[PDB]
Amino acid sequence: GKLPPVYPVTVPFLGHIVQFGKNPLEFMQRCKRDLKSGVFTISIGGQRVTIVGDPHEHSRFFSPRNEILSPREVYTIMTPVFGEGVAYAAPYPRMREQLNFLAEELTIAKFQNFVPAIQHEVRKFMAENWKEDEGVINLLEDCGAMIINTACQCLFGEDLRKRLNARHFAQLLSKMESSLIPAAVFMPWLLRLPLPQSARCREARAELQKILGEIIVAREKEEASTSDLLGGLLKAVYRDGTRMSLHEVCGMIVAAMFAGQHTSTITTSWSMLHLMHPKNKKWLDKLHKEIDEFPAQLNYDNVMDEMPFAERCVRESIRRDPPLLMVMRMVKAEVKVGSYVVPKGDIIACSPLLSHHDEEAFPNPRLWDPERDEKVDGAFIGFGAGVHKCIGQKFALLQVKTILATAFREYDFQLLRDEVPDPDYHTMVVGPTLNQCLVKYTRKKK
Amino acid sequence: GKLPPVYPVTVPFLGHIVQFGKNPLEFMQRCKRDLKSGVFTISIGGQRVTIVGDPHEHSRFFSPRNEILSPREVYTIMTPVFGEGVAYAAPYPRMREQLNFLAEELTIAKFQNFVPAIQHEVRKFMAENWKEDEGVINLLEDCGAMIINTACQCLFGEDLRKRLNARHFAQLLSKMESSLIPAAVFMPWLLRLPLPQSARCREARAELQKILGEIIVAREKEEASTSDLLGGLLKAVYRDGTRMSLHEVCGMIVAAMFAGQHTSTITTSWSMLHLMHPKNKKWLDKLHKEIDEFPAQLNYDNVMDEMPFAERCVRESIRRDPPLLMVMRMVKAEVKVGSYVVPKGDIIACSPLLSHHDEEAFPNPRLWDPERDEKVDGAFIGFGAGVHKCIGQKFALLQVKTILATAFREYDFQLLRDEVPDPDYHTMVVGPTLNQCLVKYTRKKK
Amino acid sequence: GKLPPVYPVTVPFLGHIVQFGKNPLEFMQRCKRDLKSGVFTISIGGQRVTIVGDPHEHSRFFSPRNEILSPREVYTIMTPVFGEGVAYAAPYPRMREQLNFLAEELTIAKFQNFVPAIQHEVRKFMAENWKEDEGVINLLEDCGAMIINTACQCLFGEDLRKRLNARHFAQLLSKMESSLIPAAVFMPWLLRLPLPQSARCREARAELQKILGEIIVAREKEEASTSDLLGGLLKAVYRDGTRMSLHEVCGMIVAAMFAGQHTSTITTSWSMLHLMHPKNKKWLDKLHKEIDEFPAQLNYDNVMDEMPFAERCVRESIRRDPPLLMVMRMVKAEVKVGSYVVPKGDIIACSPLLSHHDEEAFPNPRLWDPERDEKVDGAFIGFGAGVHKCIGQKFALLQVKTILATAFREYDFQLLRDEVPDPDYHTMVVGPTLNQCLVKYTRKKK
Ligand SMILES: O=C(N[C@H](Cc1c[nH]c2ccccc12)C(=O)Nc1ccncc1)c1ccc(N2CCN(c3ccc(F)cc3F)CC2)cc1F
Ligand SMILES: O=C(N[C@H](Cc1c[nH]c2ccccc12)C(=O)Nc1ccncc1)c1ccc(N2CCN(c3ccc(F)cc3F)CC2)cc1F
Ligand SMILES: O=C(N[C@H](Cc1c[nH]c2ccccc12)C(=O)Nc1ccncc1)c1ccc(N2CCN(c3ccc(F)cc3F)CC2)cc1F
Ligand code: HEM
Ligand code: HEM
Ligand code: HEM
């Protein structure tokens, strides 16, 4: 085998994470240029990280099975929050079955009544918060509130929402996030030591599990028709003929809510931010034309089948600013990538950021252009690819499209600074800088 | 409960400590503004830190007992230097009794002969080091030398000083400080691992303990009158009727000397730095008027009761540049703070820096103005507040005021750069940048 | 004892390593100036580091035996790569004997046929890569390739090179380097925890050991004349009458190749970079005069005895940019350094960088001047000094001088930017910034 070339080891401890939090794109482009190779290795905290930064080789990265490019070792930071024996922390066979059970709950087939539930919360929100003829809001925080409120209406039954509302859900997820050390992907030794915040999060999730249990007992003693997410997952049956444990169900619900909270929020925000920008009026007008073709009450078919332009807007906002900068796996057995082999124990990564800004794939990559197409097949990896592709993608897109169509139909927006906000690359999920997201809404003439 | 809002988690490991060491004020003001709340939470190394940045809520932070906002877990870094079973490392009841025994040794009631002892060392120092009609000194280092020399004359008997002089004391404290990892407040897992520097410091303190023991044996075999600090503490009796161990006494002496070495030094320096600045001549003239009302030999009453203006100068230098930027505690049981609850396991903090620069409390907070008053009651927290307030405050103020009155009576000073020195926020105790503290003394016409 | 003075402890974890990776010279000069002492102590991660930054006191640092200023504890990071019981990881007596056995293999006495072997590889390389009349290359990478290719021809027999060629060797060393955490010199607690990359490197070296074993078995079953490095080391006999183990031999070969890969490469590059710079034409002309005094085929005597000017060029490039910025040891028993004592447990360091830029020793230290002499005796410490001085120095100098003489005889070079490249201080071995090393070769008129 030929090893990819290697950026030589630097002295500050985890110093490359600082660069990755400040200018990740430029850092990776430098690595690529200096070593004259799209496939290259860096060393972070003693751990080799090999980045497939050539769009043409995406298939090598996304094809292999979890047994061989495993996500388990790279997501050890998440075990306290989701639970032992849940998702990435489960043996491979159970892992695959659990993920699939969640994927089954979020198929287009399961979305009956979701668009009206979403429209209802959004309208409730706009009437509570956007009351005036005119007013100033933080668009990032309000999208975030709408994402959690709308997800909770779609996924959880009324009895569940009565005991556990979106605000409590939001707090719990936010507390959990605050307990993580994202750098510890490169500090596996740390995660073997006792961490107090870890015990705290497990009690928090155990409290959630208690609520969930009480709900099931109450539903079981009043029935004659549990087709919400909780209900669906409790009815799943593994290949061996057993059921998921409530522990496992609770964990998968947390993971689903945790996954969508920032990614979908960010995507909504960027999309709305580009569309209200004056130099994009042409695309806004185009969006209104599409929306006005439709009544007030939307449905699944309108949003998902009959809004191709709104789709290009959302996709191109994920293209330009992907909220997850890296997809990563642990190499469990060595793998070929072009003329190279990437050895076992390496972390192998593919970067939606680096790849969405490749000039060959996306000519003039700093331009937000909803009409563009990829020049390289598979270079859009906003939701990953292959067999492990985002299983929440259709649910996320339904939410974002519905919120977009409801909001722009009822309100005009103006960004209260000249340029679109800069991404803030310091956070785990990357989105627009919070203090640059002030916007003025104006209620449209009824 | 409602959780305070949370700055979302950042990727560089302990990256917020870098900002806290470079621009802490601006970092915290940003957190406050971006989240629209004076009470807010950040995550450092996986550990939630909730900052009470509203001056009006100081009472919630400073009221609770050590059983419930505990200092023990946040000061684990200090256990090697002070000893197991000493101070913050003692069970709560013993902790309280030990701290109180030290507080009792440093009451105004115990200061007979301190002002003359201080004046004597300062005069000895000025005659050894400031010999000429005119000359250049580093004011920060010389204040530091005067603080340790004067503390040793007040607190330790001649026999003790003969075996352990201020220079040796200074070295030992300085060696101990060099062994600490202040960031490990956010790395409790680290402090459970063996650290070699920790064993070294304990041998150093054990050597100190040996000297102290020999002194006691020598005093016990020559007496007919141990009213120094060592003597006082050895005579303390716990509620159960036993005595502190020599181990515990030794530890409390170290902690007392360690506490005052930089804080008091820094406060002296800032005070002298502002007063010699030309735009402050008006306050200098005012200070001389007050000093000239008094003979050469001062006494307790002059310094502590009859120098109200010198007091405003020292207080306002602590206001403008508090040497401890944060008071912190571990939440052992949850607590209310305004409309929020701060959960167990959080670190809860209140910042004298952030609070002394609040515009409502201290209008035009960058101005050093000794005549100002707080506009918010309890917003001055230079020495903390409540039941856990600095127990060295009266001793520190006596030293600083005495040094100020002795030095300015005998010398004029001029700062050898245009602007007052910038604080250097990189160190544990924060003071003026060392290389900006060059000053020229001029011996006054006798 | 008097302790050296101490820069007071800073809050960011390992924050001084960031400064050391960005501007080490300025950082250390600041420490020296601010504390008014050439001998001074900083605290990194809780570990005191005392730097002998006075050229006049070099002898204190370099005299003491390994039992008392030990390299073992500071080079724990290297144990996985070289092996347990090898070099710095061996008990002191074995350590001394092993190092000596390697030193014996690299004495001038052992270099018969090295200059022709080197000239042969360099010429092979130039003909493969520098084929045209004219062309653009990265001088740093090509010197690196020449250093490893030429070392392998000198040190390893044909049978060994047939199974393990320079490219495979280069990869293996590069993989090993990528597994290190240089900051962990200041994190001894980390190196006591399991690190996965450590197990990987040991398997890699075990694979190398297997190849080496097979070679020995094959040589042992075909002989009638193992005078390469492998052969030499296998014939070494300890004081007790036993032989090195193949494990130990394998480890010492790795350490030798690892030591020379960047240091010698960097030194070649800098030397060539200065000599092709136009303002240095005067020294280039001088170098050609010396080279032209000699045939095409060089020999040991020409290179090592008859090239005094080429020697000054190489030495002065190591003077101006020493590839190892610090020589460090663990104080095992306390030691005097001027008016100070440096206690046990301190890391004591001497910096070739700081010392080669001292204005007293090297007037106008930013000027590359091959005719200069030190103004302070022992201030050149590019290869260390004393009893522990670099044991590869004569081999490194032979390689560098031979490559210099062969290349400049056959080619002209031009740097494709105006100024000599900046050093990149981020890496373990420090050399010229990689992307500033583009050069244009021109084949000379035959
Ligand atoms: O937000 C993250 N993850 C969280 C938690 C999570 C993890 N895996 C999941 C699988 C399913 C559901 C949730 C999760 C998350 O919400 N991820 C997510 C995944 C899929 N779909 C939506 C959201 C996350 C985000 C960033 C991150 N980093 C920071 C960048 N990094 C990195 C990588 C390479 C470098 F050179 C430098 C770097 F700094 C280490 C990985 C690590 C992370 F875990
Ligand atoms: O100088 C410090 N402490 C030392 C040692 C010490 C500790 N507790 C004591 C109680 C009694 C006597 C001595 C001590 C000290 O001398 N403190 C002191 C306390 C009271 N009166 C005078 C002096 C010190 C100083 C700073 C520090 N940091 C750095 C800032 N930090 C922090 C906190 C929040 C953030 F967002 C970011 C930050 F970086 C962690 C706390 C931690 C510390 F321990
Ligand atoms: O390149 C390094 N070493 C490697 C591996 C190695 C170690 N010891 C050996 C002995 C014999 C052979 C190989 C080795 C190496 O190739 N060193 C080498 C030594 C002698 N002759 C040639 C090369 C190396 C290079 C730098 C380094 N640092 C970074 C700077 N540092 C440091 C020190 C003081 C500070 F204030 C701040 C700092 F960041 C910690 C030491 C540590 C290292 F181990
Ligand atoms: C805009 C929103 C989202 C973005 C941009 C996003 C992005 C991604 C990406 C990049 C992957 C990696 C896929 C691969 O390995 O090739 C992924 C996987 C995943 N996403 Fe999302 N995601 C989003 C929303 C969601 C939501 C709402 C859920 C809720 C269930 C979710 C759950 C997952 C899961 C479970 C996986 C792992 C699939 C596996 O390992 O097989 N994501 N997502
Ligand atoms: C200018 C000098 C000093 C400053 C600015 C200062 C500042 C502080 C502050 C802010 C606190 C926290 C009090 C609270 O929890 O509300 C404190 C506590 C303390 N200080 Fe100081 N301090 C100084 C000098 C000293 C000295 C000379 C000693 C010597 C004994 C000392 C010993 C203590 C102790 C023991 C506590 C803890 C009290 C407790 O937990 O109950 N300090 N100081
Ligand atoms: C330009 C190339 C090199 C430079 C600048 C360099 C620099 C140094 C320095 C500064 C030392 C520390 C000596 C002391 O403690 O006083 C040293 C030691 C050493 N070098 Fe090198 N070195 C180079 C090449 C090599 C090579 C090619 C080898 C191959 C064997 C090597 C092996 C060693 C060893 C084994 C030591 C440790 C000697 C001991 O601890 O007794 N070095 N080198």
A213 vs A234, A237, A252, A255, A257, CA distance in Å? 11, 19, 15, 18, 18
Q: Please tell me if residue A339 touches chain C, with a CB cutoff of 8 Å.
A: no
Residue type, B19: Q
Distance from C-alpha of B265 to C-alpha of B274, rounded to nearest angstrom: 14
Nearest alpha-carbon partner for C374 in C358, C387, C385:
C358
Cβ within 8 Å of residue A279, ≥6 positions away: none
For residue A18, the chain C residue with the least C-alpha distance is: C18
- Ligand 1, atom 39: closest residue by C-alpha: A17
Helical (H) or strand (E) element with C113:
none
Helical (H) or strand (E) element with A295:
none
- Ligand 5, atom 33: closest residue by C-alpha: B390
Chain A partners within 8 Å of B33 (Cβ): 435
Q: Which residues partner with A135 through β-bridges?
A: A441
- C208 Cα to the center of ligand 6, angstroms: 23
Name all chains with 3 or more CB-CB pairs below 8 Å to chain B.
A, C
Backbone phi, then psi, for A64, in 5-degree steps? -70, 150
Distance from C-alpha of B221 to C-alpha of C424, rounded to nearest angstrom: 66
Cβ within 8 Å of residue A437, ≥6 positions away: A138, A139, A140, A141, A269, A273, A421
Distance of residue B203 Cα from the nearest chain A Cα, in angstroms: 28
Cβ proximity of B438 and B303 under 8 Å = no
Distance from C-alpha of A76 to C-alpha of C295, rounded to nearest angstrom: 64
Q: Which residues partner with B237 through β-bridges?
A: B243
With b for 16 or more beta-carbon neighbours within 10 A and e for fewer, the C7-17 pattern comes to bbbbbbbbbbb
Distance from C-alpha of B19 to C-alpha of B26, rounded to nearest angstrom: 9
- A328 Cα to the center of ligand 4, angstroms: 12
Instruction: Spell out the alpha helix ranges (H) of A39-107.
Output: 58-62, 79-82, 92-105
Residue showing tokens 């497990």: A202
Residue type, C398: L
Helical (H) or strand (E) element with B86:
none
Instruction: Spell out the alpha helix ranges (H) of B83-113.
Output: 92-105
- A428 Cα to the center of ligand 1, angstroms: 6
Distance from C-alpha of C251 to C-alpha of C230, rounded to nearest angstrom: 11
Backbone phi, then psi, for C330, in 5-degree steps? -90, 120
SS3 B429: coil
Question: Which experiment gave this structure?
Answer: X-ray
Q: Please tell me if residue A33 touches chain C, with a CB cutoff of 8 Å.
A: yes
Distance from C-alpha of A106 to C-alpha of C105, rounded to nearest angstrom: 69
Q: Which residues partner with A210 through β-bridges?
A: none
Structure tokens at C152: 């392998």
Structure tokens at C356: 């080669």
Distance from C-alpha of A41 to C-alpha of A347, rounded to nearest angstrom: 9
Interface test with chain C among A2, A6, A7, A9, by most C beta carbons within 10 Å:
A9
SS3 C50: strand
What's the number of CA atoms in the CB half-sphere (13 Å) around residue C268?
Answer: 32
Distance from C-alpha of B100 to C-alpha of B104, rounded to nearest angstrom: 6
Does residue B201 line the site of ligand 2, with CB under 6 A? Answer: no
Residue showing tokens 């004359």: B153
Distance from C-alpha of A5 to C-alpha of A425, rounded to nearest angstrom: 26
DSSP letter string, A110-177:
G-TTHHHHHHHHHHHHHHHHS-SSEEEEEHHHHHHHHHHHHHHHHHS-HHHHHHS-HHHHHHHHHHHH
Backbone phi, then psi, for C415, in 5-degree steps? -75, 130
Estimate to the nearest angstrom the gap between the alpha carbon of A413 and the chain centroid: 25
Distance from C-alpha of A65 to C-alpha of A68, rounded to nearest angstrom: 5
DSSP-assigned letter for residue B173: H
Distance of residue B184 Cα from the nearest chain C Cα, in angstroms: 8
The length of chain A is 446
Name all chains with 3 or more CB-CB pairs below 8 Å to chain C.
A, B
Does residue A298 line the site of ligand 4, with CB under 6 A? Answer: no
SS3 B374: coil
DSSP-assigned letter for residue B303: I
Estimate to the nearest angstrom the gap between the alpha carbon of A276 and the chain centroid: 23
Distance from C-alpha of C101 to C-alpha of A137, rounded to nearest angstrom: 75
Q: Which residues partner with C336 through β-bridges?
A: C341
A295 vs A121, A124, A130, A406, CA distance in Å? 17, 18, 22, 11
SS3 A363: coil
Distance from C-alpha of C404 to C-alpha of A33, rounded to nearest angstrom: 28
Contact B180 C9 (CB under 8 A): yes
Structure tokens at B290: 């007050």
Distance of residue A345 Cα from the nearest chain C Cα, in angstroms: 7
- Ligand 5, atom 27: closest residue by C-alpha: B260
Backbone phi, then psi, for A58, in 5-degree steps? -55, -35
Chain A partners within 8 Å of B189 (Cβ): 190, 193-195
Structure tokens at C56: 């006049």
Nearest alpha-carbon partner for B370 in B322, B311, B432:
B311
Residue showing tokens 């061989």: A68
Rg of chain C (C-alpha set): 22
- What angle do helix axes C246-276 and C196-220 make, rounded to 10 degrees? 100
Residues with CB under 6 A from ligand 3: A 11; C 16-17, 20, 49, 75, 78, 182, 185, 255, 258-259, 263, 324, 326, 349, 390, 428-429
Chain B partners within 8 Å of A435 (Cβ): 33-34
Surface of C (155-214) touching B: CB under 8 A: 188-189, 192
In chain B, domain spans: 1-446
Distance from C-alpha of A409 to C-alpha of A401, rounded to nearest angstrom: 12
Estimate to the nearest angstrom the gap between the alpha carbon of A323 and the chain centroid: 7
Other CB atoms within a 10 A radius of the CB of residue B281 amount to 11
Residue type, C304: M
Distance from C-alpha of B442 to C-alpha of B136, rounded to nearest angstrom: 9
SS3 B364: coil
Residue to probe by mutation, ligand 5, list B58, B383, B402, most atoms within 8 Å of CB: B383
Distance of residue B195 Cα from the nearest chain C Cα, in angstroms: 6
DSSP letter string, B253-286:
HHHHHHHHHHHHHHHHHHHHHHHHSGGGHHHHHH
Q: Which ligand approaches the C-alpha of residue B58 most closely?
A: 5
Q: Which residues partner with A243 through β-bridges?
A: A237
Distance from C-alpha of A56 to C-alpha of B285, rounded to nearest angstrom: 78
Distance from C-alpha of C254 to C-alpha of C260, rounded to nearest angstrom: 10
Estimate to the nearest angstrom the gap between the alpha carbon of C176 and the chain centroid: 16
Strands (E), C36-128: 39-44, 47-52, 69-70
Rg of chain A (C-alpha set): 22
Distance from C-alpha of A100 to C-alpha of A106, rounded to nearest angstrom: 10
Does residue C324 line the site of ligand 6, with CB under 6 A? Answer: yes
Surface of B (42-81) touching A: CB under 8 A: 43, 45-48
Distance from C-alpha of B201 to C-alpha of B82, rounded to nearest angstrom: 9
Distance from C-alpha of B301 to C-alpha of B115, rounded to nearest angstrom: 9
The length of chain C is 446
Rg of chain B (C-alpha set): 22
SS3 B134: strand
CB-nearest to C48 from B178, B190, B262 is: B178
- Residue C363 class from Cβ within 10 Å (0-12 exposed, 13-18 middle, 19+ buried)? exposed
Cβ proximity of A372 and A316 under 8 Å = yes
CB-nearest to C189 from B179, B195, B434 is: B195
Chain C partners within 8 Å of B201 (Cβ): none
Sheet with A134-138, side-by-side order of all strands: A134-138, A438-443, A411-415
CB-nearest to A10 from C195, C200, C427 is: C427
Distance of residue B353 Cα from the nearest chain C Cα, in angstroms: 16
Rounded to 5 degrees, what angle do the CA atoms A384, A178, B184 make? 120
β-strands A134-138, A438-443 pairing: antiparallel
CB-nearest to A197 from B3, B10, B47 is: B47
Cβ within 8 Å of residue A147, ≥6 positions away: A260, A261, A264, A265, A268, A399, A403
β-strands A347-350, A47-52 pairing: parallel
Residue to probe by mutation, ligand 4, list A67, A156, A252, A383, most atoms within 8 Å of CB: A383
Contact A8 C427 (CB under 8 A): yes
Distance from C-alpha of C153 to C-alpha of C113, rounded to nearest angstrom: 10
CB-nearest to A20 from B3, B11, B34 is: B11
Backbone phi, then psi, for B98, in 5-degree steps? -65, -50
β-strands C423-424, C431-432 pairing: antiparallel
C221 vs B186, C158, C214, CA distance in Å? 62, 16, 11
Report which ligand 3 atom has the smallest distance to the Cα of A11.
29
Cβ within 8 Å of residue C281, ≥6 positions away: none
SS3 C340: strand
Distance from C-alpha of B315 to C-alpha of B424, rounded to nearest angstrom: 20
Look at domain C1-446 and name its CATH class. mainly alpha
Structure tokens at B40: 């807010």
Residue type, A332: K
Distance of residue B41 Cα from the nearest chain A Cα, in angstroms: 9
Distance from C-alpha of A377 to C-alpha of A344, rounded to nearest angstrom: 28
Strands (E), A197-334: 327-331
Structure tokens at B288: 């001389």
DSSP letter string, A396-446:
HHHHHHHHHHHHHHHEEEEESSSSPPPEETTBSS-EE-GGG-EEEEEE---
Other CB atoms within a 10 A radius of the CB of residue C34 amount to 15
SS3 C43: strand
Distance from C-alpha of C271 to C-alpha of A134, rounded to nearest angstrom: 69
Structure tokens at A199: 């015990």
- Residue A196 class from Cβ within 10 Å (0-12 exposed, 13-18 middle, 19+ buried)? middle
B390 is in an annotated binding site: yes
Chain C partners within 8 Å of A43 (Cβ): 177-180
* Resolution stated for this PDB structure, in Å: 2.0
DSSP-assigned letter for residue B8: P
Contact A10 C175 (CB under 8 A): no
* Chain breaks after residues in chain B, where C lies over 2.5 Å from next N: 225
Cβ within 8 Å of residue B126, ≥6 positions away: B406, B407, B410, B411
Does residue B349 line the site of ligand 2, with CB under 6 A? Answer: yes
Nearest alpha-carbon partner for A331 in C200, B414, B20, B433:
C200
DSSP letter string, C135-158:
EEEEHHHHHHHHHHHHHHHHHS-H
Cβ proximity of A313 and A342 under 8 Å = no
Contact C48 B174 (CB under 8 A): no
Distance from C-alpha of C328 to C-alpha of C343, rounded to nearest angstrom: 15
